[model samples]
Target: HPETLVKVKDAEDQLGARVGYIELDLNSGKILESFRPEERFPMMSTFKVLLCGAVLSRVDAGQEQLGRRIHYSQNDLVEYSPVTEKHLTDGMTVRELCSAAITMGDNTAANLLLTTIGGPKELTAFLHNMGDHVTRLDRWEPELNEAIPNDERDTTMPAAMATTLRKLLTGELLTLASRQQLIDWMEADKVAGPLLRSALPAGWFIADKSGAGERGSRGIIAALGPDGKPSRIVVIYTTGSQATMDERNRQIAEIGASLIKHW
Candidate 1:
């Protein structure tokens, strides 16, 4: 079937941005719709989802402990780390860090978890092991959100992210408990709360991680469906636009609207 991509393309033109998106059925692994799905976009805070997935994989293998408490000082904090900045004295557990990083896009929590997993390259290696070659984590927080044009550092394809997310959530990448925990974190993540989600029809539940970068770039990786258990995955990203974050979000929201209308 030919993909019209008309609505999403229109959004791209209206915003003067490069848009990459994909929607896949989880049960059949069928790509339902796409637009420049292979083009790389800065992962930004979206990488935290994969970071926590890497942590969960280690937990499944007994290489890591979610309940383990990690200590940190005031100097360790990074910009936009809302959760970490609040707990400078008491520190937090591994699970708490994962939750904060994924649910709230806490940069310092992500950095601390990144250190726990051995850094950016290790996260990239974890992605490689997960059968994702197009996604890479090249830097720590803040810098990763630079969104420099044509620079592939800390970037990933929309298709790659959707597929990797499908595997982590539905495949045997992690034990049932670990998978459930990851889903719980994503369920609590509300970064997409007022953005793309605003465009979704009622009665649909979504678990997602959203990312915002310099240059008005924005994205959301999500699993959503009408059923209690999400059966569809959607990945949407925009880059190279000087538009405001609100406009970028509305563009993504419009894309989401088209997908659901077709469904």
Candidate 2:
């Protein structure tokens, strides 16, 4: 444990920031590695993964349909909505919104999904029902990425998020189809290039969601292992740095290097 902490602390020093991470055994629920694992970090776009999971729960209960089209005008668009902006005319299905939000980090798409599930408080209630109390959704996208210092809003502890991910993705929280869909969306993520994905060896498989903004804050939640099935879950976050985004990415990647090396 100290070994992992040392490496994580080194990464923090290199970035001149506070770094927090937790590497857990997916099935066994063991704390394989960590540094400030209980500390809160801004959830950022990472919450979309959970947001989609909540939506799927409604799907499982027959309360929602992914194929249902949602129409919106330019007024509905939010900042940084690449995919949803393109679909403004035709509208997009719930499934497409989930994909755009999780994989492409489409802020508008996330907000759309958020609305369907009854907004931030509703998502928080869903997490509580899932037995996760540490992860909370306080605001819509763009604003949620604020990463305000000493503010707990829209923040989560690495340990809490890792456990919730375990429950949502691997445990009995979701039906088999729903769980797989969630994993596939995360695996299709386009936002992870310079983080854990870049640090790991080529043969290792990684399904992850990464977030960045405000005070050089950045984070990634990933299920990684060799071949197809994931064996470990990693949650890594850093904030309060004056570093550039690339430098922050490198620091997180450094932690990834240590994780794989240690295991």
| Candidate 2: worst-modelled 10 consecutive residues by lDDT | 1-10
Top of the candidates by TM-score = 2
Candidate 2 per-residue C-alpha lDDT over 1-263 given as tens digits, one digit per residue, 9 for 90 to 100 = 56767878888888888898899999898988777888899988899999999999999999999899999989989899999999888999999999999999999999989999999999999999888888999998889989889899999999999999988889998999999999999999997898888877878878899998798789999999976779999999888999888888887887888788787
What lDDT score is found at residue 174 in candidate 1? 89
RMSD of each: 1.3, 1.0
Model 2 regions more than 4 Å off: none
Candidate 2: global Cα-lDDT? 0.90
lDDT values of the candidates?
0.88, 0.90
User: lDDT of model 1 at residue 201?
Assistant: 71
Q: Show the colliding residue pairs in model 1.
A: none
Q: List the residue pairs that clash in candidate 2.
A: none
lDDT of 1 by residue, 127-185 (tens): 99879999999999889999989999999998999999999888889899988898899
